[model samples]
Target: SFVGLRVVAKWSSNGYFYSGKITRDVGAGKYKLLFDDGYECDVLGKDILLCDPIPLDTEVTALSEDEYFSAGVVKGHRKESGELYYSIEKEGQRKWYKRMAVILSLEQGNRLREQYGLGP
Candidate 1:
């Protein structure tokens, strides 16, 4: 899931956040990461990460349902009341209803995406 995003795994270790490029899988729950400066480290796992949000102006495939959305550029960010979501280029315009959020039910999402040829 996270590896595909290619977003720096803002890996959280207590209060520290190490941003780096994913390099390889080190173990069942470990991943080798190469930091920008050439330092390499193996992190615990995605569970300890906060993936960076999709970059702005980057084109990716989107929807703007009342509480759901489609694939498009990362147009913007917003928070209304207590809800948070991304304002993406839905269809041909921008709308605030997108979440590159974690697949809520990992196993189920895995099975579903696999049917569509998508996977971690």
Candidate 2:
């Protein structure tokens, strides 16, 4: 029951930021979600909280996939234009990864600093 693997929704309301976890993969990038912009504004896995599986990135990463320079490991790429650059690095020896991977990692790190307890 890998119910807590960090994941982001496929589509966001404001394109700002709203991350969720894997309740289970049912395609359509995992259809369902729960966020602060909803009722019962607290914690506790309200409903079967679902969200699509956007990729994760974090690397000495680059590749102008769009205007938004992704920072994750190479998730993969597309054909005829390269939806991904499909690159490499020295971390997990990954083959491809998602958009803004590095920035996301940094953001998550900052958010979880107290959980792991480190920093001033």
Candidate 3:
């Protein structure tokens, strides 16, 4: 069983969150984040801590369309006070459902927002 927790963004950065699995570990450490969109990023310890939510004023990049769609659906579930179900074809057809929050730094989020006129 995976432990449930929250993670807030440290700086303005773009990345995808891994549902059903906690991508970053809690503690002082560094990790290699492999987003579903094929984007990889190195995250520091302090950057992965749970914190207050930050508004995301941004647009999804073309390369990260798949990740964005999946995240969007999950986000929708949260807004609707419903649950989201996702299945994995591999790993013996495992299924999982949980709530998650994706945080982005003000600058990073705003940049994308400006690019696509998706600002708040």
Candidate 4:
């Protein structure tokens, strides 16, 4: 049912989200994902995150004034001039979501407003 939709798949080892799209429905809640680099893999629905509704309270990591992404959780969203942004709270610390947000359960880092553009 998720075929053709853009998505992000979680890499269990690294816990990062990589941008991709569902190509084929593998059935049993699994689907074949084609990533941005042309690599393909089979993944379960749970490991795949929908881009439109990025899920409230989604555990994520993002860039935080440092080279490495800091661990955080998605609290809420904000819209500005037709753009959207996710409110990311660090491990107790708080910061605005910009540039990108990586889904802890998916793959690749994506722009906040570009990927999560819709309001729910």
- Quote model 3's TM-score: 0.28
TM-score versus the correct structure, for each prediction: 0.34, 0.24, 0.28, 0.53
**lDDT score, residue 71, model 4?**
66
RMSD of each: 11.6, 14.3, 11.6, 7.6
Candidate 1 per-residue lDDT over residues 16-37, each given as its tens digit: 2333556776677777777544
TM for candidate 2 is 0.24
Find the 10 residues in a row with the least total lDDT in model 4. Answer: 111-120
Q: What digit string (tens of lDDT, one per residue) describes model 3 on residues 43-114?
A: 554344332122232221111224442222111122334443322222223223233323233444334333
Off by over 4 Å in 4: 12-19, 27-29, 36-39, 64-67, 78-84, 91-100, 105-120
Please identify which of the two predictions, 1 or 4, would achieve the higher lDDT against the true structure.
4
What is the alpha-carbon lDDT of model 2 when measured against the actual structure? 0.34
Tens digit per residue, CA lDDT, model 4, 1-120: 567887767555665666678899877767888875476888766666677445667667666456477667777777788545678777686666642444443322334434552212
- Stretch of 10 with least lDDT, candidate 1: 110-119
> Model 4: which residue pairs collide?
9-106, 9-107, 10-106, 17-106, 17-107, 17-108, 18-107, 18-108
Error of 1 at 47 (Å): 11
Report the lDDT tens digits of candidate 2 across residue range 36-63.
2242112223222222333334233343
